[PDB]
Amino acid sequence: MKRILVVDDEPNIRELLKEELQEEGYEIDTAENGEEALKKFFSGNYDLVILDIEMPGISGLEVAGEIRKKKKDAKIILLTAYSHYRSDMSSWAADEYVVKSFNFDELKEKVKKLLS
Numbered sequence: 001m002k003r004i005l006v007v008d009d010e011p012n013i014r015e016l017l018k019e020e021l022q023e024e025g026y027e028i029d030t031a032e033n034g035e036e037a038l039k040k041f042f043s044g045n046y047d048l049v050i051l052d053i054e055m056p057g058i059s060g061l062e063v064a065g066e067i068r069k070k071k072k073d074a075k076i077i078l079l080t081a082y083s084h085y086r087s088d089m090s091s092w093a094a095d096e097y098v099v100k101s102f103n104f105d106e107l108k109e110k111v112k113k114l115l116s
């Protein structure tokens, strides 16, 4: 089994992502903000972290930078409603950047790719 930490400030979106990823065969933990995400990730043993960007408190881009710095081989997907940050250099900390879509096929492909 692979374990994924799903980080997003919107509870109904956390819930949706948790359901979608459970269907693909993964075990899912969640965090509601960046600080919680870092606490969970550093103390835990995740295969992949999926990170929203816009959240109250530190942004997902800040979180991605910290994970990359303290876990060199971490697998990180930025999953955000907004394509704005794709050309943001902070986004370079992540392995993949996915804009949220109601069709989850693309996110699932990128997940399967990183968990190879």
Ligand code: BEF
Pocket (backbone or CB within 6 Å): 052, 053, 054, 055, 079, 080, 081, 082, 100
């Ligand atoms: F609030 Be996330 F960047 F869609």
Ligand SMILES: [Mg+2]
Pocket (backbone or CB within 6 Å): 008, 009, 010, 052, 053, 054, 055
């Ligand atoms: Mg958000």
